[PDB]
């Protein structure tokens, strides 16, 4: 069931009485046909924001950007694999010491790391444009369609993964909490694995900069909740990994005896 197979949000074309209304309105617009008309009051023309054609174009705009952002990530992975292949095949006629190999090997790691972060940044800009297009659809009826929920979760997942590689952990928390509220995404353990790390970053910063204890507990409480939930979804309840995490969480939090 590929909800994005047809590449649109909602299909478009029944009652004879309704078809009678469509006839007279089209006749009315023909009398008042003025292609140069621009409305001083935008309230009436803003009703087009609720139309299915409007939402269709917004979805196809967001879909257009999402494919661009995934392309940057995937084309980069191809380059890194190809880049390493070429280096091993060229002749090193001026290397007769082990330390020279480490120096040559160290350069490749930096070249690889340099291109990855460049590619990650391009994807995030592409993903961010797609997010704004999705959020300017004002009809809740069309926002519940399986086509919308498929791309909305797909966009957030790609945005979060790119953001975490750029080490912008605190920005993933607001997006991830919206991600796990769509369909059965809350049952995905990676979604709670990322929030386990992201909330740990928040706790460390509050600890480092010596913020309030209330915010310290909140980030610690959220960190343990999603650390446990991620453990349960992957290793199952009452499992040896689950028992270990509960011991860690019990030590990490406060218990009143």
């Amino acid at each position: 069931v590929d909800e994005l197979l047809k590449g649109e949000l909602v299909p478009e074309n029944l009652t004879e009485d309704q078809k009678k209304k469509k006839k007279e309105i089209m006749e009315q617009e023909s009398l008042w046909k003025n292609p140069d008309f621009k409305g001083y009051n935008k309230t009436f023309q803003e009703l087009h924001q609720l139309s299915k054609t409007f939402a269709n174009n917004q979805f196809r705009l967001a879909l257009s950007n999402y494919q661009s952002g995934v392309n940057t990530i995937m084309k980069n992975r191809d380059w890194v694999e190809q880049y390493r292949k070429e280096e091993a095949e060229k002749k090193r006629l001026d290397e007769k010491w082990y330390w020279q190999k480490v120096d040559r090997k160290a350069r490749e790691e930096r070249v690889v790391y340099r291109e990855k972060m460049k590619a990650k940044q391009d994807a995030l800009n592409y993903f961010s444009k797609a997010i704004n297009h999705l959020d300017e659809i004002k009809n809740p009826d069309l926002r519940e369609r399986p086509e919308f929920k498929r791309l909305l979760s797909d966009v957030y997942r790609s945005w979060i993964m790119a953001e975490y590689d750029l080490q912008n952990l605190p920005q993933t928390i607001p997006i991830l909490e919206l991600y796990i509220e769509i369909d059965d995404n809350e049952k995905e353990y990676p979604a709670h694995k990322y929030l386990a790390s992201a909330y740990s970053f928040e706790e460390n910063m509050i600890k480092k900069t010596k913020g309030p204890d209330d915010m310290l507990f909140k980030y610690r409480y959220k960190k343990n909740v999603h650390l446990l939930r991620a453990t349960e979804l992957k290793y199952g309840k009452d499992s040896p990994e689950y028992k270990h995490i509960v011991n860690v969480i019990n030590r990490d939090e406060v218990i009143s005896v």
Partner: protein, 56 residues
């Protein structure tokens, strides 16, 4: 944002708190300087032309 010192979508600006980041900012400032230098050349050219027209 227009000078390349900020992202016109994310709205994050350049940072120097890491040695690796700071080295790539040198190129960013080189581009930013050329953008400012170019625009003053355009403004300077407009003034010189208008000066001839006012004289004429």
């Amino acid at each position: 944002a227009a000078l390349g010192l900020r992202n016109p979508t994310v709205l994050t600006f350049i940072s120097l708190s890491t040695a690796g980041k700071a080295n790539s900012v040198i190129g960013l400032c080189d581009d930013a300087l050329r953008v400012i230098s170019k625009q003053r050349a355009d403004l300077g050219a407009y003034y010189n032309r208008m000066e001839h027209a006012a004289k004429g």
